[PDB]
Symmetry: C3
Subunit: 350 residues, 3 copies
Amino acid sequence: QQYRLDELAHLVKGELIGEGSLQFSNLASLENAEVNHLTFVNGEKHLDQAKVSRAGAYIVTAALKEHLPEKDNFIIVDNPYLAFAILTHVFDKKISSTGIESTARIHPSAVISETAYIGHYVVIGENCVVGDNTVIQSHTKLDDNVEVGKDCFIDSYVTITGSSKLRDRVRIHSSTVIGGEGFGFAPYQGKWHRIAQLGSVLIGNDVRIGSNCSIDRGALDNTILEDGVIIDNLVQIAHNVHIGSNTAIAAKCGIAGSTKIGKNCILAGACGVAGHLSIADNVTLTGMSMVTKNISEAGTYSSGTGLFENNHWKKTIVRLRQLADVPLTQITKRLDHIQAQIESLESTFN
Amino acid sequence: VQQYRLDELAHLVKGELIGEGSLQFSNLASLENAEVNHLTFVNGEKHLDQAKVSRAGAYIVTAALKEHLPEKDNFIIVDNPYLAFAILTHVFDKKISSTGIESTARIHPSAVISETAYIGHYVVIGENCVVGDNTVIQSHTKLDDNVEVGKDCFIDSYVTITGSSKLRDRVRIHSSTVIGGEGFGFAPYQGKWHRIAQLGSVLIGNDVRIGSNCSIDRGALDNTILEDGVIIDNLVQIAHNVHIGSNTAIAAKCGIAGSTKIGKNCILAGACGVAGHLSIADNVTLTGMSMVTKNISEAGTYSSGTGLFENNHWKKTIVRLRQLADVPLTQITKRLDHIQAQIESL
Amino acid sequence: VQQYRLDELAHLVKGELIGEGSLQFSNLASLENAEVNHLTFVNGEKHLDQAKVSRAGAYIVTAALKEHLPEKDNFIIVDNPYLAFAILTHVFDKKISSTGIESTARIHPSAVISETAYIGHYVVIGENCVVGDNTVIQSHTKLDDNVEVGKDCFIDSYVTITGSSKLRDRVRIHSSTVIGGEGFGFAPYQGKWHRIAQLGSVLIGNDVRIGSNCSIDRGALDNTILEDGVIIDNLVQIAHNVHIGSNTAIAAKCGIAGSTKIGKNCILAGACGVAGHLSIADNVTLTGMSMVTKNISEAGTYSSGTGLFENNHWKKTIVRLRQLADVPLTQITKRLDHIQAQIESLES
């Protein structure tokens, strides 16, 4: 199946140039796009690859189009990237399948929409709810009192337990565990007394969660992910974590128990955040940041040493292992003082 | 929900009762959300303000902390509120009394399954496997040949236990974990890597917890060993032949490289990385995201990392780090010594 | 149950046999665990204690070490006992004997499965799928539409293969792993994120090993690529459009961000993070927890980290590190120089 240029321009409220009747199989990169492909050009950094590209038509900005005169077909928009983002869904493989496969094992007390798809070997517990147009891909399981709203996607090998409540348009990818028993252990006798985790999880609308994630239920109360939170693969959300709306959590972040992260935060890959902390709205964290105390104000925060060639690096960590011995500041202040008694004596004897 | 008299609850934790012991409670609950029919706890002076504002009917607290709750009537006095609470959470837990073998379970005729075990839908169990008394093996999970699971164990969905792994009693393993999988055994030669097949196993002791999306690899020949009481959080990597001593806790996202020994009662925070062929002594604590590349022979708390900087301050600091190597760092208390010596005479 | 003759075993390792070449063996085992029906080995003198008292029926050894084992009868003599062990592991490695398709599998009729393939219980296989000769697909796994697997592949349980990923030959994918799933594509607009559907796929080359609990995402456009001979340990993130060159090794807990290219024969230690849109040359080694945010264009060895400190010594060092920016460390020797200057230029 194919889509006409003008039909796509319309979807992104973008100005068409050339022939709109042109049909495309797909969107494609500037390098591998044939004439049956639409492509995008995100600022002048892509110009050269664009110029020599064999794509049929080009999503561009007005300024960029002028610099692309050997080409005939365009969609002109303010944000070429966002326009691209919109159009991908046109060409995304959609699931229209409906109903329940007979390999499935659902409790009779469950409410399952007529417009929902329940895949093969799916197991659904007591008083569960699955809303309109939601997909539950094969093998997945919903424990008792798990609710899932409408237009969700739940991929295979997903464990939803601890009575979790999922709102609408929630997308949960494979091998992810939602609302499993969190890491609650009380120290005694040099042994560890397990704590049975008795709260749940509340995931808001428009949340995406990657694969191989663990979003633990609350010890008491709730693990909450507000609306529009996005979470990449291999992330740990510990018990009673609360993530504010529209926050983005990159792959391999870990957030320890009882921790609050504000709205509109951006955490880069492999960040770690200790337990029982508060992180303000509009906080950004670059790669491999470890956070041990509250961040009380908006901004960008970092930790780490960056990359060094091996020899340089070794020289530097020795210099660090020496650093606590070397009185830095004191040395500088003793200089100032020596500078002072020089300054004076040079003018006093003059 | 079923209720309990406050005196029963105090007795179960061997605590002191203050208030009317015939008052019944329906649940535990947080300081924030607790209601008149709930029991809560306060652990440290840091939760006192919250407690003061709490609607909770009764307070698990400490003799000292009780002094600061004048407006509150009902107490259980204990040395450690956390533990007391820990003990009581199981009384209010949704307790799974189910037994039998689901109809969709494929079980080899040589497997021995206790009549008080539960086996979920779509479980697979190989030749010569033992499932012990009161053990729950949830749906879709598989137990390859020669795997053994002791008594009062819990194994969740999408779990793989292969490598003929043996599990003792009260073992708790969470969803989509792989136990006994082939470890990372590869030989370098002339710019190629050559796979070596791994032929040892996994031994898991009594009272071991392992979280979701964990990977506990089998040993190469000898074993990966987790001693009694080890607790492991989500997304942890335990390589081939790693040995972890009793009661050691491993927080989320740690990685232990192959053939590393970890002592008794160690504590590693989240996202630590410990290299291969290392020894770590009993009673070692590692703070979040710490890296270990050498043996640690003495007990204690260790740490790596810069701490957090605001980005712009951070950048200027790494400018300085990159410079550190070129500065004669230790030679300069010596040069200042020399400079002050030639003012001394002047 | 499965047995091999001593002499067959000596042949495989190009070894020389002392004792009876008709004796059969069930397994390889350690000196301490080994029984009469098991073969073991000795590398170096250290382990002759365990060897002497081992119940093993046969001993892969060197000719020098055999002399320190008088009470034993059956040996395979070789140059490197460990290397010989290594070869034989594959012989004793429990391989799926069965062949064909379990009745519980659900397969779209447009799939093409070899008769020598094993398709396990509760496997789901979508449209236009292919499964090559001798390939094992263990129970509970699914191949989504248009996915292909080559010959001699091992594909364990609870694996997702989607984004119509293409797998060449002798590919091993361990349990609970996700191949070709939707990458992390989000366009920022006025605070919110617009999800970007992910339209390309995954190309996995021959002799690739991928561990358990890994995520290798599909391409946004084009393909995420693992070139032939790449090995990846457990719990690793490979983002969209990542391209990993020939025979590169990626240790546990590594994360590689979107559209990064990694050269041939690179080695990455545990818990490395590589940022997006980067190139890393052939022959670059990264030590534990390395932080890459720029292209690495020369082969060599690179690194991040402070070193491990005792906690209190740690606290003292970071306090010092915190004040480092407010310190003209560069001018200190020229300040000491200058200070000693106007000391010398004072006397007259």
